[PDB]
């Protein structure tokens, strides 16, 4: 599936993914695209911080017929 992630210009990008990947498998392809190493990447969604170890499917991501992301750089 596709998601959308609000970099820090307020543009955005496109990743693909599933929905059982683990956020930190999301920071290291944001990582690929942005160049913002995953330990200063901050992922919200829904108005809610995503952790590392859970997945995108914790917080129901792939129910939403668009995916919106926010990354904040940390700090």
Do not use: C, W
């Not at 599936?1 to 683990?22: A, W």
């Not at 809610?48 to 859970?54: A, N, P, Y």
């Amino acid at each position: 599936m596709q998601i959308f992630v609000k970099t820090l210009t307020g543009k955005t990008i496109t990743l693909e993914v599933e929905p059982s990947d683990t956020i930190e498998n999301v920071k290291a392809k944001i990582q690929d695209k942005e160049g913002i190493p995953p330990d200063q990447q901050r992922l919200i969604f829904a108005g809610k911080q995503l952790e590392d170890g859970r997945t995108l499917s914790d917080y129901n991501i792939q129910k939403e017929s668009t995916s919106h992301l926010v990354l904040r750089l940390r700090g």
